[PDB]
Design a protein around this ligand. Sequence first.
Ligand SMILES: Nc1nc(=O)n([C@@H]2CS[C@H](COP(=O)(O)OP(=O)(O)OP(=O)(O)O)O2)cc1F
Lengths: 548, 398
Amino acid sequence: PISPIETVPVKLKPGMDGPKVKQWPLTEEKIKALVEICTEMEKEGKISKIGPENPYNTPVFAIKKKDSTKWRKLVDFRELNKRTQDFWEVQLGIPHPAGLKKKKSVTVLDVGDAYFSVPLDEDFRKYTAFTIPSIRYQYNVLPQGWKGSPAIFQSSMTKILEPFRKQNPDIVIYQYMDDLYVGSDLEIGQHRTKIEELRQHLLRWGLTTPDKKHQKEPPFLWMGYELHPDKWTVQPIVLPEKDSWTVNDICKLVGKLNWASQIYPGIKVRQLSKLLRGTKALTEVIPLTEEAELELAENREILKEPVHGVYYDPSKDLIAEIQKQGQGQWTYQIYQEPFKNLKTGKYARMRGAHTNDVKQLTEAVQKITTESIVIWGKTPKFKLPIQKETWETWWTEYWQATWIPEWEFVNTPPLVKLWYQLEKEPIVGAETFYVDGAANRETKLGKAGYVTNRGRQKVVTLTDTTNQKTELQAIYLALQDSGLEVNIVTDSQYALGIIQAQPDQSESELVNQIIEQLIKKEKVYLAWVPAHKGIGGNEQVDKLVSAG
Amino acid sequence: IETVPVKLKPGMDGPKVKQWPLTEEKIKALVEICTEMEKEGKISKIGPENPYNTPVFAIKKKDSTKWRKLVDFRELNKRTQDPHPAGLKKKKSVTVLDVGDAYFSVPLDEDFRKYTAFTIPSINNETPGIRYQYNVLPQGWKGSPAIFQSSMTKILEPFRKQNPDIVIYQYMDDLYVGSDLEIGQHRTKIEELRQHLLRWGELHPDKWTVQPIVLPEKDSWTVNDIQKLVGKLNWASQIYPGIKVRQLSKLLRGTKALTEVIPLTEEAELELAENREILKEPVHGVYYDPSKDLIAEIQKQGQGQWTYQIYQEPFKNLKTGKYARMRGAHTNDVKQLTEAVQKITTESIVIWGKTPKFKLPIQKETWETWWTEYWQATWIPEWEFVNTPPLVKLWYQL
DNA sequence: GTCCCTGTTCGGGCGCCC
DNA sequence: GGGGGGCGCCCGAACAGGGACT
Ligand SMILES: Nc1nc(=O)n([C@@H]2CS[C@H](COP(=O)(O)OP(=O)(O)OP(=O)(O)O)O2)cc1F
């Protein structure tokens, strides 16, 4: 039936008018599915025959559902969607089984033909004109294909349930579209009585709940999961086995893996992900790199294993544990009692041209924190592979505000560390290098070199380069020709800002070579001086590399 | 009471900022507060055909069992169609009262209401968001004090006449009250005003430090010392054109070991004397201009020390100061840093009756993850995040 | 001014849900 | 097979802001 709920007032965008677009051809089978559905909707007042008083039109079609027997009628409203006003989406995210608490009685219910039970504003009905080829109808209810439909339904549903929620604050109703998870701490007879009350409430507002879709016994099928009473599980994940992979193939495998990582610990997709670079189209084919090759294999082995998650006990604590995976990849498991994960995940986001492990760890902690707050509404305690002293050093010598919430060290390598440590004071008995670089904007030609206090001077010439690059080149050069202990003096704010942040990884081949050298050295000390101010021997090296 | 029509700036649409995730604590407080406000006509449930939105959260005050709802109207305020007392910056004591309650007594122009929508989230997305709209003058909207000014002036009217050398200033939801009364009589005065305000329905400005730049004193100078020195002065000379560097730079003639000690010539020893003084004299020629924003810059100096400079045009510092704190274990940079921007916002309101735009030395995600856990003010400054060149770090060092 | 380099947003694919 | 809203993940395009240089 149609809800007697108030319609939600909608309008087109200003100066815009409804859509005129020719129906396209349809399969015979689809045409029959269509009029079986329409002759029935029309009969129930969900749609009305229109005449020549309606200029507009929009193409319709259909697709089989998950029950494979029933058809879902759809409307390619892409055009009317463009000319329909903005809504504020009310759905703020996706509920997660690991955020559910142990319940004594559980029920799952679908609403029957949900959209077609919510009336559509009268002034707007005309813009939904469609045509069934073999009859011209228009929608009186919400149509599947329009951009107003999800939020209008989600809000409508929330109105309808407020009364029951307020009357019954200790029944918990997870509400995702027309899907309802209902949980209570009542005995099965009392619970079932409450479910009937909920079904009648819903039916008073025109929303039927078919028994066919009413789950009474575990395990429950919910949001892609199976809820058993003490544990939950994700419905099986199947990975493609192409031997030739396209961009789309790849993109389709990284998704299923991401999906998998919420409960499958140790998943990685760096090497797969790299393939996706430069590829100008979904259909492009790409050969797996040797390391991508190997990676996919590791994940395939992971999926074979049997795994579940548990529900949430608020009396206990939330603990998050982080594992370093290499190459800017991290895995985490969130739990309350050891070896009983609530859930898991990964962090593999490369942010920054240059960075190091302690930074990324800080970024992993922040992501996990934000996610725990969405799912459980509180921060977890951390276990991290980083010694208190390492973190203390980094915090001490980093010119930025940084911080991690309450955490305890876990010696599960590979541990997170600082791979080198610049000195705070200049080094006694270490050769002092004054480095510099210059480049010609037009020719792209340049020079990098040094001068040392012991009389050494070297100048190297370059091509297709830049100022920044030649400043970084000069530094690399001084590391290459210096001993195990070196003082380096530069006038490059650019170069000094990178190196002082103690990176161990970079996009830049050159910064990587520099990092290698910094790791080998026993002591390095980097000082800055303002350029072009006659400060020897910055002055001396300036003259050298300035033959351009 | 008939409403005061209000408009947006021209060619501007209403705010559309996504709500961020809240803790359980905060959501329960907001659900609790909102249902009451709804029970009193102050806010109404709305649908999603209202396309606008503005974030919301909540703070638990000091030692208390009371939460304060706090809507982030920074965007709205930026898009809303648009006399501070010099005397307030000079008072032994200044007390800050929260008069936000007062606004709920004034209806809100019906056409404007839609631009004040907000959304309450649920734990683990058990439900879609619950959207509300305002029916009165919302706290945190810069429109609220404006429209309520006239009624405000009547209220404080005779408290002022009766106490003509207590100065009362209003900024947004806030009332600033300064006096030279010894604490106790200032306290008894403040409560007098509060009594006076229930009938209708602490700081110390004078003792705020200025943070001079300063130069090392040494018996032995090495090449490295002098190079650091010269570079610091080369930059300081953008602020203080008086600064001179030539005689010191002459000691760095040649190409020498960083740890070689160098005896200061008497000239270079001299200009060291000058520069030391050219730093004492105040920054000449910097005029506060309200057509432009106050920019605040903050630097982490370590050991819980923080430095900052308020300016409108680069190198033209209106003020430069310092924030010190605890030295130990539980030190939390993010908490110290939000305390810093709150002390600095506070000083700006008091001195120029305006809010600074902060340039913050923190990662954006690190800050947005945690600042609402240390926030205690009814307003919220504008900010932007900025990884600061490790050079300026040493310029303002103490 | 321009060029260079770095950081943000934002839209485009895919994953999952209904 | 062609539609919609939400979140997630990656990527590249656009554009912003600071430094170095003519
Ligand atoms: N792919 C989908 N597009 C949609 O627009 N919908 C919308 C949003 S939820 C609403 C109804 O979902 P259901 O899958 O329960 O389908 P239904 O209510 O149309 O019919 P029924 O519940 O099977 O009786 O249809 C669902 C889809 F799966």
